Amino acid sequence: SKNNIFNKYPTIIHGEARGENDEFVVHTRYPRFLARKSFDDNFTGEMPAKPVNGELGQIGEPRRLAYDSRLGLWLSDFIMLDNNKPKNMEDWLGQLKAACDRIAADDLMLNEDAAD
Amino acid sequence: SKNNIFNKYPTIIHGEARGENDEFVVHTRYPRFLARKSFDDNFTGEMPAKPVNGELGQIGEPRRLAYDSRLGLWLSDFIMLDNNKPKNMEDWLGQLKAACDRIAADDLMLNEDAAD
Numbered sequence A, B: 001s002k003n004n005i006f007n008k009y010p011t012i013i014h015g016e017a018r019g020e021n022d023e024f025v026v027h028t029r030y031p032r033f034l035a036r037k038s039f040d041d042n043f044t045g046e047m048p049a050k051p052v053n054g055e056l057g058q059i060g061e062p063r064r065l066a067y068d069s070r071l072g073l074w075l076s077d078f079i080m081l082d083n084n085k086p087k088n089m090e091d092w093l094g095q096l097k098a099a100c101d102r103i104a105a106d107d108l109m110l111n112e113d114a115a116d
């Protein structure tokens, strides 16, 4: 089973590619995905008081699913690495938002790790 | 089609996770995969004269497919992100080795990018 091998990986993986300012992320637990992570020009990288609380919505033309952390970090171009079909859409959207919030928070931790 | 969305991503993505010394890679062209990338204790990070020329083999107990760059960099725990079944095994193994050699070479470029 491929899904089990994912479990050998750390839950959140932060990625980059040469020649690219945009970054990338892989989420290795359900719902598993690859996503692009981009940053507003005025992104600070300072952790907020309350936990991260972003929104998933359809944006741009054509409308594409995207995640706005509300802190300057975006996730887009999602690719689901599971082949199942989620029974409940509301549940699936919710589980995906919660994974994005953690990824966003995990990314803010990168900067504070480096200051230490 | 999921495969086409992969094409929006840069071919090779280099990853890390907090709390982990091992690193990660995602290859976004055929054959697409996620892999763990690890390093001998005496890894230098200096580019070689001739191109990278690693080997894929079965290693460890139980025997697992792994890639040895012969330069200190390893790839293991491969997860194929395509669901097809390769017609020819020799061809498939070969295409995978060639992707690993580029990934290894792309990783050596990370260090020389940073020196510049």
Ligand SMILES: [Mg+2]
Binding pocket: A060, A061
């Ligand atoms: Mg617009």
Ligand SMILES: [Mg+2]
Binding pocket: A045, A107, A110, A111
């Ligand atoms: Mg950052």
Ligand SMILES: [Mg+2]
Binding pocket: B060, B061
């Ligand atoms: Mg041994």
Ligand SMILES: [Mg+2]
Binding pocket: B045, B107, B110, B111
């Ligand atoms: Mg390195």
